[PDB]
Amino acid sequence: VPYGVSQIKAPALHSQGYTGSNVKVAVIDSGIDSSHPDLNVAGGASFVPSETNPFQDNNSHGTHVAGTVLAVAPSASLYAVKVLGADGSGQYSWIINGIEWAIANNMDVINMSLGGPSGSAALKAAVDKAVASGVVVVAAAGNEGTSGSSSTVGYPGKYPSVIAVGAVDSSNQRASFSSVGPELDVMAPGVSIVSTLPGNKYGAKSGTAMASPHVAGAAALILSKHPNWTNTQVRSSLENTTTKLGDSFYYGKGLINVEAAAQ
């Protein structure tokens, strides 16, 4: 479909018969516009006290993100976890609740196209708990740019249990905005990602929010092929089979290769 799908080598798996079928992916974002003809939202929950409906995306964020998961893993079961409000901001508690819901709800993949500058013990316990449970936890690295020799990587992405996804363009080049550091795991396409928008729309968005779902989507592709495989197995598969870009501080392991990861 869109360039980022080809880039990650997704199509090669679609042809072979691997589309993410029977994989449960939670999008912990501003909701998903379930009304979108293309989007099949299987369920969800809201943790935003003022925004009761998970299936309503007042931002556009969550709908775009969900769209990306679906283009990579078209047969995957999408779950909308509303943690962010119309403004794009959310409480750490709302987020924790969203992680907890995903665990309790037997999610296979968590997508967190979100990040903050500071962490919490409650945050780390939650993410680490998702991992202990067998969930593949995906998060954007952040859009912090550089800070000399300092890690720019936001939370929950900073955490080792969480796959930290940075951004590349269609030329395999690091996006200027892309958070850097030892904590950066993988690179996925995040420059001008054309996806689903609320109210039967499509539009381009840039950021690590865009890169993350490509990995969340890639993870669902591997689980469709290897149903038996642990989160640990999925993650290793992804990280170990990458297209090596520059330095690890900037690129991590490089670009994901869904085709090589699926063996």
Partner 1 sequence: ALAL
Cβ 208 to partner 1, closest distance in Å?
5
Token digits for 43? 């369920």
Cβ 225 to partner 1, closest distance in Å?
28
Given the complex with partner 1, which of 74 and 207 has the nearer CB atom? 207
Number of Cβ atoms within 10 Å of the Cβ of 106? 10
Half-sphere exposure of 163 (CA within 13 A, CB side): 37
Cβ 133 to partner 1, closest distance in Å?
21
Given the complex with partner 1, which of 195 and 208 has the nearer CB atom? 208
Nearest to 178 by CA among 119, 255, 126: 255
β-bridge pairing 41-46 and 77-82: parallel
3-class DSSP state of 120? coil
Interface with partner 1 in residues 196-255 (CB under 8 A): 207-210, 212
Distance between CA 150 and CA 124 in Å, rounded?
Answer: 21
Interface with partner 1 in residues 98-117 (CB under 8 A): 113-116
Q: Which of 8, 9, 26, 30 binds partner 1 (CB under 8 A)?
A: 30
β-bridge pairing 24-29 and 77-82: parallel
Q: Which of 9, 61, 214, 253 binds partner 1 (CB under 8 A)?
A: 61
Which residues are CB-contacts of 200 (< 8 A; sequence separation ≥ 6)? 35, 36, 37
Which residues are CB-contacts of 195 (< 8 A; sequence separation ≥ 6)? 2, 63, 64, 65, 67, 68, 71, 202, 203, 205, 210
Given the complex with partner 1, which of 30 and 257 has the nearer CB atom? 30
Binding mask 80-99 for partner 1 (x = CB under 8 A): ---xx---xxxxx--x----
Binding mask 122-161 for partner 1 (x = CB under 8 A): ------------------x-xx------------------
Cβ 194 to partner 1, closest distance in Å?
17
List contacts with partner 1 (CB under 8 A): 29-30, 59, 61, 83-84, 88-92, 95, 113-116, 140, 142-143, 207-210, 212
